[PDB]
Amino acid sequence: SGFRKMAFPSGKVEGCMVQVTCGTTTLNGLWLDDVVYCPRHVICTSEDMLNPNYEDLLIRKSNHNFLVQAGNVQLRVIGHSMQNCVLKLKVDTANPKTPKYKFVRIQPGQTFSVLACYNGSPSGVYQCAMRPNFTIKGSFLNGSCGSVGFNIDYDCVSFCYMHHMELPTGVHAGTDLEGNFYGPFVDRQTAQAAGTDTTITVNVLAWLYAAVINGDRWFLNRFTTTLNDFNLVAMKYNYEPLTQDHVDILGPLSAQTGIAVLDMCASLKELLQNGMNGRTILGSALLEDEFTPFDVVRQCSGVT
Amino acid sequence: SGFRKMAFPSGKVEGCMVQVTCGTTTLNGLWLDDVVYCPRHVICTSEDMLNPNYEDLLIRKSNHNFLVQAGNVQLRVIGHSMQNCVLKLKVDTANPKTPKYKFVRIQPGQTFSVLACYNGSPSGVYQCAMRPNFTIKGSFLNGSCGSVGFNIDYDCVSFCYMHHMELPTGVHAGTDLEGNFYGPFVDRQTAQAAGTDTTITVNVLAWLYAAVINGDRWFLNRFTTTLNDFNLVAMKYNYEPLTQDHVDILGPLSAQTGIAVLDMCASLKELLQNGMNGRTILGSALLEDEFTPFDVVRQCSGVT
Ligand SMILES: Cc1nnc(CN2CCC=C(F)C2)s1
Ligand SMILES: Cc1nnc(CN2CCC=C(F)C2)s1
């Protein structure tokens, strides 16, 4: 029993973190096989960051200008290229700790673990969601750039996020491991405003199911609703619209609890309209939206 | 910027988890040097658990009855002893992944990371606090017993917790790595009620400082208070009394923010008396008490 915001065990990713230095900029890189992946703004001065021409800046850089340190041992850079917003540094040594891995581009609402790192050294691990406005709400200080987000399936790490920047509002933006930003963000120190941070409805419902499984049931009511009726309420409260795809994904939690998805929607609708009246659900005073249905199944079933 | 409930990177502990089986009971063990540590109730049938005589049950067990598997390789048990509520299985092989480590018995209010494990396999990592009633609010299913709680100081893992049981109220109880329960709990399937789960005041204040550092400042008010006056309010709200030791520990956060500790106490007092009025602090609708002052400094400064 009990339900916690849980990160994947980070060991497989810890074994992949290195320090990258170019001139006087140090950040984190990800060493997989004989490639180190890092944010391309490693090549920028904070002056460069105001309006960088990355192709022009990169002309001035040779392999030997990229200092890559794995623990306290230097890696030899034998090649470098830019792919979108990441640099790929080819090194002469395959990372011996390379896990089975994939690169995935996640959808908004998907959760992942972040291994926050500084100078190639892991500091902590926490669980994030890709927000519907393609930001994440992380914990990143200066030097954390190149820290990565990941999911683990048994022994395979799916890397989905590399940290690139903080918006002036203190939310975070980054790329997949092909260097494509999530959302409309660019790796430039300029005005970039996030859109509406809507609530991930299907995740809230998953978490309500998790609550029922764990004995928090006070919010269950006598009502049901329809997708269309629920969606009018969702719109009013800046919740994402619920689709039949979302209902389908919640089917196993519906089956396990015997609470129809549309009944749980009606419970959520009343919570939106009435608030929590100073009560809590799984130790939260607000409706948690950073657990996916898959997360809830995993934690509630004990997958390793 | 940003402030997250952050666990220590778990790799060093992942390398220590093994499966222990005795008869038909399987749970987790901790392999450090040539000793595997696990809950002594590994020797019990669920029938035994109602009123176990562990010394009498252990007489019937030989080294070869303890099956210890590290990944998919069996360890040879060459000795076994009971220390309090843990078994120590001497194996013929030192764990090659043994980190620098210590065993510490933590105080109520102290935070630590849990590596939830099943069959010796890590499933997830999350951040816990030892509650003032010596319970923790974890996420533990059947098979998670022997999962451990830890802090990391640079390269040294301080193990503080091993998971033993769930109370009928679905909160968790366990031992230090000398096998002494936190609190009055016993490893028996009997009525065991937790005492008052009071709020860890010094942790709430730390988290309020974290909020100010991260730009959440709406709750700062024009007032101050005294320890005695604050403590009358704390008592009323089932908060732990604040001592000058707690004020001393908050000194660096006071210094960094320029907010006197007693001023932040007066802010907390108003939040207790007035509630949040539907507002949030660091994305929470309730006052978070599972960050220590040391945690807040660490996360806000970026220690690795
Ligand atoms: C060199 C650097 N100087 N500042 C940095 C942080 N941010 C600034 C905004 C945009 C990013 F992509 C990187 S990197
Ligand atoms: C064999 C076991 N059968 N049930 C177990 C879980 N709990 C029950 C309560 C008290 C504990 F120490 C262990 S262990």
Side-chain angles (χ1 to χ4, degrees), chain B residues 25 41 44-46 49 164-165 187-189:
Chain B
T25 305
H41 75 237
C44 298
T45 73
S46 65
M49 277 317 298
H164 287 244
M165 62 189 200
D187 46 356
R188 181 176 170 206
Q189 175 139 305

Side-chain angles (χ1 to χ4, degrees), chain B residues 70-92:
Chain B
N72 280 27
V73 74
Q74 211 69 24
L75 301 179
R76 192 179 296 279
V77 181
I78 61 174
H80 68 274
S81 54
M82 187 164 53
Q83 183 178 8
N84 300 314
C85 300
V86 292
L87 294 171
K88 300 198 312 221
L89 309 175
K90 201 203 204 200
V91 290
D92 73 347

Side-chain angles (χ1 to χ4, degrees), chain B residues 166-198:
Chain B
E166 193 161 65
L167 305 193
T169 58
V171 308
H172 300 117
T175 68
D176 62 22
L177 269 294
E178 300 182 340
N180 289 129
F181 268 86
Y182 290 98
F185 305 115
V186 296
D187 46 356
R188 181 176 170 206
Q189 175 139 305
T190 184
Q192 301 180 69
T196 306
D197 195 2
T198 60

